[PDB]
């Protein structure tokens, strides 16, 4: 069919862009490689990148849930990078969202506002494709479910999210919208590997503390020690767990 | 189940109630004892950060929903001297105080009046607890009459 | 045996209306007296602050405290009685801003404590954080003779429980300008702390 070859287009553009957008290190500096998927360019690493992964999300969205989604995080992921690198992609990044605002919708071109619009309907991409089966590839086919990895999608938007709020009297963002946009994960919780537990919650206390919210961290530190807790394997001594016990 | 308490000034706990229905007698199964007073602990703050704004997230006094987790809203009242009366609701489905906005402004407006009549004594300090007998029927024949 | 501090008691809804034990009122019913019950009640205050006060600076701020627990019982009482239990009494305004309260405390409270509203609130204009409240006749301390102020201090007491529990941590201080033929002026300086001036900019 013509969703197949599309299917298979769709599977081959996002991996396809994932490792050349992976190919930077250090702002790609002197490692002049055998240029075999390794360009090791000057100052346009983040540019080829953002090329190749503008043409796969193209394509993604030309082929339009899960995928579609990772592919418009992708496009996300490579606007921010390339704006991060002070170079002259801003036009052409911001023009760069042909298919991200007709699958997804910017609208904008401030300083990543445009990436909070990106990552919302990203989000709503990932709520999208939560209505399907939980797992859909091989290995993942008798997985948990999405819901460990919506997760991982929304705990970088809050790391990404609340770093524009710096304390001085202009706030960014007001202070109280990233503390909406934190609480929509009360998923159940119940099941997953504990060292995602543990950085959650302790990345959610320092969003909590540079937020400026000194009981709303004793809240969640209270959930790591019940989840610290009712593990039923062996844990050893280790001295973050003294200044954890310390700091509450 | 419904969860009620009058936090001071320092959030030392002035009084401390439960009331739910009697088709659950034994109210909030494992949520009483471990998540129910750091939900209000915890959700002091952002009532304590809507006490100096003009306006929410022209009365200033009655506060809606501030905060809705797993499904349990709570609602605020700041009163005059500080003293928040913060309440937690409960439900099987998603409860909604919305249905009760119009009526509870008067059940706090009503336990605000008992506050004001037990703070006139003068040999009531401020941070003690109330350790009134007529405390507890004059808030629960208002929490049976008007929910 | 309701609120102890070693539970939360769990009672459930919609029991028996159970007998009703005492009962009470909150409305004004203006009720007068003389100035001179005042004023024997006052100078017996100070005939025993007198007597168990070492130097003059305790004394001051141990008068202080008298007026403290009548300001902190003041603020509940004024605005809820003045925004109107069983009468669907409504709320005023909750004011939160630091020349709302002034207005409030100058218009108001010397106008339930005395007959007359005080007649004037004045800026330091020269610098900022100092804020004269002055009257013309203090009548509680009107029959003290001489000219030191110590004996003002349980009106001053009044003010700054009123707001050191309305969430305006400050600190009062009573001088004497005697302007004019008014020879008992009687100046207040209520002086905020730092560490509340900048939330009023924020």
Same mark, same amino acid.
């Given at each position: 069919?013509?969703?197949?070859?599309?299917?298979?287009?769709?599977?081959?553009?996002?991996?396809?862009?994932?490792?050349?957008?992976?190919?930077?290190?250090?702002?790609?500096?002197?490692?002049?490689?055998?240029?075999?998927?390794?360009?090791?360019?000057?100052?346009?690493?983040?540019?080829?990148?953002?090329?190749?992964?503008?043409?796969?999300?193209?394509?993604?969205?030309?082929?339009?849930?899960?995928?579609?989604?990772?592919?418009?995080?992708?496009?996300?992921?490579?606007?921010?990078?390339?704006?991060?690198?002070?170079?002259?992609?801003?036009?052409?990044?911001?023009?760069?969202?042909?298919?991200?605002?007709?699958?997804?919708?910017?609208?904008?071109?401030?300083?990543?506002?445009?990436?909070?619009?990106?990552?919302?309907?990203?989000?709503?991409?990932?709520?999208?494709?939560?209505?399907?089966?939980?797992?859909?590839?091989?290995?993942?086919?008798?997985?948990?479910?999405?819901?460990?990895?919506?997760?991982?999608?929304?705990?970088?938007?809050?790391?990404?999210?609340?770093?524009?709020?710096?304390?001085?009297?202009?706030?960014?963002?007001?202070?109280?919208?990233?503390?909406?946009?934190?609480?929509?994960?009360?998923?159940?919780?119940?099941?997953?590997?504990?060292?995602?537990?543990?950085?959650?919650?302790?990345?959610?206390?320092?969003?909590?503390?540079?937020?400026?919210?000194?009981?709303?961290?004793?809240?969640?530190?209270?959930?790591?020690?019940?989840?610290?807790?009712?593990?039923?394997?062996?844990?050893?001594?280790?001295?973050?767990?003294?200044?954890?016990?310390?700091?509450? | 189940?419904?969860?009620?308490?009058?936090?001071?000034?320092?959030?030392?706990?002035?009084?401390?109630?439960?009331?739910?229905?009697?088709?659950?007698?034994?109210?909030?199964?494992?949520?009483?004892?471990?998540?129910?007073?750091?939900?209000?602990?915890?959700?002091?703050?952002?009532?304590?950060?809507?006490?100096?704004?003009?306006?929410?997230?022209?009365?200033?006094?009655?506060?809606?929903?501030?905060?809705?987790?797993?499904?349990?809203?709570?609602?605020?009242?700041?009163?005059?001297?500080?003293?928040?009366?913060?309440?937690?609701?409960?439900?099987?489905?998603?409860?909604?105080?919305?249905?009760?906005?119009?009526?509870?402004?008067?059940?706090?407006?009503?336990?605000?009046?008992?506050?004001?009549?037990?703070?006139?004594?003068?040999?009531?300090?401020?941070?003690?607890?109330?350790?009134?007998?007529?405390?507890?029927?004059?808030?629960?024949?208002?929490?049976?009459?008007?929910? | 045996?309701?609120?102890?501090?070693?539970?939360?008691?769990?009672?459930? *809804?919609?029991?028996?209306?159970?007998?009703? !034990?005492?009962?009470?009122? &909150? @409305?004004?019913? +203006?009720?007068?007296? =003389?100035?001179?019950?005042?004023?024997?009640?006052?100078?017996?205050?100070?005939?025993?602050?007198?007597?168990?006060?070492?130097?003059?600076?305790?004394?001051?701020?141990?008068? *202080?405290?008298?007026?403290?627990?009548?300001? !902190?019982?003041?603020?509940? &009482? @004024?605005?809820? +009685?003045?925004?109107? =239990?069983?009468?669907?009494?409504?709320?005023?305004?909750?004011?939160?801003?630091?020349?709302?309260?002034?207005?409030?405390?100058?218009?108001?409270?010397?106008?339930?404590?005395?007959?007359?509203?005080?007649?004037?609130?004045?800026?330091?204009?020269?610098?900022?954080?100092?804020?004269?409240?002055?009257?013309?006749?203090?009548?509680?301390?009107?029959?003290?003779?001489?000219?030191?102020?110590?004996?003002?201090?349980?009106?001053?007491?009044?003010?700054?429980?009123?707001?050191?529990?309305?969430?305006?941590?400050?600190?009062?201080?009573?001088?004497?300008?005697?302007?004019?033929?008014?020879?008992?002026?009687?100046?207040?300086?209520?002086?905020?702390?730092?560490?509340?001036?900048?939330?009023?900019?924020?």
């Amino acid at each position: 069919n013509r969703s197949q070859q599309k299917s298979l287009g769709r599977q081959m553009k996002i991996l396809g862009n994932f490792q050349l957008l992976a190919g930077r290190y250090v702002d790609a500096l002197n490692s002049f490689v055998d240029a075999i998927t390794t360009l090791y360019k000057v100052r346009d690493y983040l540019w080829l990148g953002s090329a190749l992964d503008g043409i796969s999300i193209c394509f993604l969205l030309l082929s339009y849930n899960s995928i579609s989604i990772a592919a418009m995080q992708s496009p996300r992921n490579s606007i921010m990078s390339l704006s991060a690198p002070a170079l002259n992609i801003d036009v052409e990044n911001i023009n760069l969202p042909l298919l991200i605002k007709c699958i997804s919708d910017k609208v904008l071109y401030y300083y990543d506002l445009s990436l909070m619009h990106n990552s919302e309907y990203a989000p709503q991409v990932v709520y999208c494709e939560f209505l399907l089966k939980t797992l859909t590839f091989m290995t993942s086919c008798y997985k948990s479910s999405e819901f460990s990895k919506d997760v991982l999608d929304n705990i970088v938007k809050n790391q990404h999210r609340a770093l524009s709020d710096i304390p001085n009297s202009p706030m960014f963002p007001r202070f109280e919208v990233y503390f909406y946009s934190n609480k929509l994960f009360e998923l159940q919780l119940k099941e997953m590997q504990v060292e995602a537990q543990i950085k959650i919650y302790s990345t959610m206390a320092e969003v909590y503390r540079l937020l400026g919210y000194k009981r709303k961290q004793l809240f969640v530190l209270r959930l790591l020690m019940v989840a610290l807790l009712a593990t039923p394997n062996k844990i050893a001594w280790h001295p973050d767990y003294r200044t954890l016990i310390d700091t509450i | 189940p419904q969860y009620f308490a009058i936090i001071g000034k320092k959030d030392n706990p002035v009084y401390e109630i439960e009331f739910t229905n009697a088709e659950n007698p034994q109210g909030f199964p494992q949520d009483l004892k471990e998540l129910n007073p750091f939900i209000l602990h915890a959700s002091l703050d952002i009532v304590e950060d809507l006490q100096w704004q003009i306006n929410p997230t022209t009365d200033n006094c009655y506060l809606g929903k501030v905060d809705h987790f797993y499904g349990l809203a709570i609602t605020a009242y700041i009163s005059y001297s500080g003293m928040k009366f913060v309440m937690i609701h409960g439900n099987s489905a998603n409860s909604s105080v919305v249905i009760d906005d119009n009526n509870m402004r008067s059940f706090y407006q009503e336990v605000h009046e008992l506050y004001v009549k037990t703070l006139m004594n003068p040999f009531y300090k401020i941070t003690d607890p109330i350790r009134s007998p007529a405390f507890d029927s004059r808030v629960r024949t208002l929490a049976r009459k008007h929910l | 045996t309701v609120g102890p501090k070693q539970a939360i008691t769990s009672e459930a *809804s919609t029991t028996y209306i159970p007998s009703r !034990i005492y009962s009470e009122s &909150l @409305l004004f019913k +203006r009720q007068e007296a =003389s100035l001179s019950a005042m004023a024997f009640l006052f100078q017996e205050m100070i005939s025993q602050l007198h007597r168990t006060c070492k130097t003059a600076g305790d004394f001051e701020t141990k008068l *202080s405290d008298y007026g403290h627990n009548i300001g !902190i019982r003041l603020l509940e &009482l @004024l605005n809820f +009685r003045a925004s109107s =239990s069983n009468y669907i009494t409504k709320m005023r305004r909750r004011d939160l801003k630091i020349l709302d309260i002034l207005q409030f405390i100058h218009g108001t409270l010397w106008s339930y404590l005395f007959n007359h509203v005080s007649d004037d609130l004045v800026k330091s204009s020269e610098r900022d954080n100092e804020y004269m409240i002055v009257d013309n006749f203090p009548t509680l301390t009107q029959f003290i003779p001489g000219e030191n102020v110590s004996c003002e201090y349980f009106v001053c007491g009044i003010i700054k429980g009123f707001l050191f529990n309305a969430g305006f941590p400050c600190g009062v201080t009573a001088h004497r300008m005697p302007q004019g033929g008014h020879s008992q002026r009687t100046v207040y300086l209520i002086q905020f702390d730092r560490q509340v001036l900048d939330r009023e900019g924020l």
